[PDB]
A paper describes a structure:
Based upon the success of identifying a residue in the flexible loop that is involved in site selectivity, we experimentally probed the location of a substrate entrance tunnel to the active site. A resultant 2.69-Å resolution Xe-pressurized crystal structure of GxtA revealed the presence of Xe in each protomer of the trimeric architecture. The Xe binding site is formed mainly by hydrophobic residues Val276, Leu173, Ile172, as well as Tyr273. In particular, the GxtA tunnel showcases a higher hydropathy index than that of the tunnel found in SxtT and a larger bottleneck radius of 2.7 Å. This tunnel width is mainly limited by residues in the center of the tunnel (Thr230, Thr237, and Tyr273), whereas the smaller 1.7 Å tunnel radius observed in SxtT is limited by residues located near the entrance (Ser230, Ile237, and Glu272).
Each structure showcases an α3 trimeric architecture, and each protomer of the trimer contains a Rieske cluster in the N-terminal domain and a non-heme iron center in the C-terminal domain. The trimeric quaternary architecture places these metallocenters within electron transfer distance of one another across the subunit-subunit interfaces.
Author numbering:
A (entry chain C): 1 to 297, 305 to 334
B (entry chain A): 3 to 202, 213 to 296, 304 to 334
C (entry chain B): 2 to 202, 212 to 296, 305 to 334
Write the structure that this text describes.
């Protein structure tokens, strides 16, 4: 169990990539305070089973075992658990039907966009949409996993912030001179939080090429995933940022990036995101308190006109009833 | 703090070989930091006290042994073998106050091991019959620091069904994983398991007179092997493992025996370090423990600890 | 924060002025508060000591840059003037920052080459040091010593004199001269005072006074040379301290490194003991309870003064 809210437990979250889960493999992960085991059978096109990493016999992690004959086997006594989590065999008592109590705690898992989505509760919410996934004109790439020692909601608040661009992202996403921020259009509606189109000022790098005027916008249907859309000179680049809430104070950041330009741009896209993500991590790791402060009437946070979309985020979290990872 | 039932039992804290004349050693029992010291005389007794000087809270272990006294390093106070301050160097003519006294504990050398009771010895040190048999040879395993409850360490050692999966080299085969109807008896002696078969041929039985001490007996084709497993309870979540192995076959087998014991212990320590909760769950976030017929000796250990009133190291 | 106001309303050294050169950003910690110390390229700019905290989104201001007499936060470039008022917000260039856009500032006074800070309202003055003005005395500063021990245990160890023959053998005593004479201890409204006493090696006469719980003035007269010192403890929190010493002497300048070496040896010998002592915090008067003998008169008096002042922070 956990101290997490039901609004959060009943949502889907990315815990891995499908390319990390090979046939016959055992992977560990952490979601909302719970340790997880992700396993597949040696069959090809095998389903991924996401359970709690715990054998109920003597408390040994099931992730220390082996996958054999479509069963996850515990290392201590060799209890064999089927795809539904039911012990189907106890080697010490091979003719005995295992007790019904011998059951692993199983969760909902679904693959989409090459990502493993998990729901610890009742899947009542839907997986965010990524329209360009099935567009053959768009190429796909994934960033590596980033472990961040900061609240899941502080990480998302940062990626909603845009006024920091000319300071901690100078040279990639901002100009320390064009640092004034225009009035921002931010909607709160049925589709979630939308930052409307807005101009990103980037520093010239190629003096031969024309200014890469970038227009960006983003939408949040889920509070820990953000769909971002950028149209520059000759390329539209969309991304799906996904935050794995490890606990109230820890988070994993992953991005699926899709672009309509030359596949040869993959290396540059991945390296440019690395720079921005690590410049953002430096601030996230220093922020206090570690949990995102919600609104109220250490001193309270101060909000200026340019914080419109981040004030609306903190408001959305109070409406959703979020108390985990926030203060 | 620990339950009186544990406070009044004997526990191994060191090997006699390592407490030399004039030496000062350290140990940790039931939450208490301990100082062990000997005088430079031969046949000197071992004094096991709390590692603390009552003047200003400095560890007496950072001091020195001099003239059959332990000297505190801060103000020079000298404590006799009974633990009483006999000289305060700033007041050389003053009879040191009665409060100037170290907290002393009972110490007894048995089986080449230093045994300590922090309470009132109500029970005797566990018996080891082959200690007095000259037909048996003697070897000691090294110390093993385990980040697990002392009671989880003993539960693992009482378990016999794990042999075919984590010990398939020495104590089990994957084609012989079935466990026969085991025999368990909890009497005044303690917890006793009746003899059972172990597949590498071998017959094995064990008895626990005390919760953290195990006597084990194994008969092979040509050799009887016995061991005394001692668990030092550092605190609720930490333990030290030691064994005294005795056998009546060739003394040349000492190295293979120690090598075999090391493999098994480090294979058990891997499961022990992973177990959650860290403290032993007793019979009463994470689901409750499930018990199968092959778990009757470990179910009896948990029942015994509950009956004895153990609340320290257990969940 | 959980500290007693008697402590919050007192002056403490958090740095030496030689460590905060023009245009620098230094960090410190005092009574649980993280502090940012910053200066200007003004050849003689003052030292600002604020809480290491940007009230916009909670970044540490110490990760910023000093520019044109302002401290600039790294996250959104907010510029705070020397009074701590934010005067620029780059996002809204022609917007006067709200009154809330203000760093939490603390009182800072430079004295004896040291940075004194008071987190509250200074009801007391910075401890006195008469040989500072005396031109016949040379001056030197020890390095900062981080001690994993209560500020009050650190000060307890400095007032102890009975331990000189055992852990400071060679500098403040030897094992053949361990008997302690009847010490003169004056506990008054001003504070704790310790009268003249003999330190062996062939001997020197020392005394000390404490007008402040965590500041000690000491005087040693030996063979015509008088050495004085000001021991300052930075209370980091209940369990941690910084130790610093300003030593002044009227002999040869050549003695400086020897003086520094003698202090360094004694201090690290004291730190070996301080780190081993349990409990970490200083036990006051009503693990076994502390026993007191006559050589411990001035250390018993320290505990009695702290209880009368109502110190609960850093004490057991
Ligand atoms: S702990 Fe998993 S089978 Fe015994
Ligand atoms: S601390 Fe042991 S003698 Fe003073
Ligand atoms: S956090 Fe300091 S300026 Fe935004
Ligand atoms: Cl399989
Ligand atoms: Cl025992
Ligand atoms: Cl003073
Ligand atoms: Fe950013
Ligand atoms: Fe084992
Ligand atoms: Fe000293
Ligand atoms: Xe980016
Ligand atoms: Xe063994
Ligand atoms: Xe000194």
């Amino acid at each position: 169990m956990t101290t997490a809210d039901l609004i959060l437990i009943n949502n889907w979250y990315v815990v891995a990539k499908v390319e990390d889960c090979r046939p016959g493999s055992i992977t560990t992960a952490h979601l909302l305070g719970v340790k997880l085991v992700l396993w597949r059978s040696h069959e090809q096109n095998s389903p991924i089973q996401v359970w709690q990493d715990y054998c109920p016999h003597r408390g040994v992690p099931l992730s220390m075992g082996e996958v054999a004959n479509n069963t996850l086997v515990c290392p201590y006594h060799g209890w064999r658990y089927n795809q539904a989590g039911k012990c189907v065999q106890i080697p010490a008592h091979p003719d005995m039907v295992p007790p019904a109590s011998a059951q692993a705690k199983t969760y909902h898992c679904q693959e989409r966009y090459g990502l493993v989505w998990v729901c610890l509760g009742n899947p009542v919410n839907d997986i965010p949409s990524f329209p360009e996934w099935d567009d053959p004109n768009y190429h796909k790439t994934y960033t590596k996993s980033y472990l961040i020692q900061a609240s899941p909601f502080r990480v998302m608040d940062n990626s909603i912030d845009v006024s920091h661009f000319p300071f901690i992202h100078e040279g990639i996403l901002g100009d320390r001179n064009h640092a004034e921020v225009e009035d921002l259009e931010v909607k709160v509606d049925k589709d979630g939080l939308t930052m409307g189109k807005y101009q990103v000022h980037t520093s010239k790098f190629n003096n031969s090429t024309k200014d890469d005027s970038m227009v960006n916008w983003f939408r949040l249907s889920h509070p820990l995933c953000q769909y971002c859309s950028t149209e520059a000179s000759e390329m539209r680049t969309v991304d799906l940022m996904v935050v794995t809430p490890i606990d109230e104070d820890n988070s994993v950041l992953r991005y699926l990036i899709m672009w309509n330009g030359s596949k040869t741009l993959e290396s540059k896209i991945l390296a440019d995101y690395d720079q921005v993500i690590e410049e953002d991590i430096r601030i996230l790791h220093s922020q206090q308190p570690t949990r995102l402060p919600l609104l109220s009437p250490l001193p309270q946070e101060i909000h200026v006109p340019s914080d419109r979309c981040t004030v609306a985020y903190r408001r959305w979290l109070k409406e959703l009833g979020v108390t985990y990872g926030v203060c």
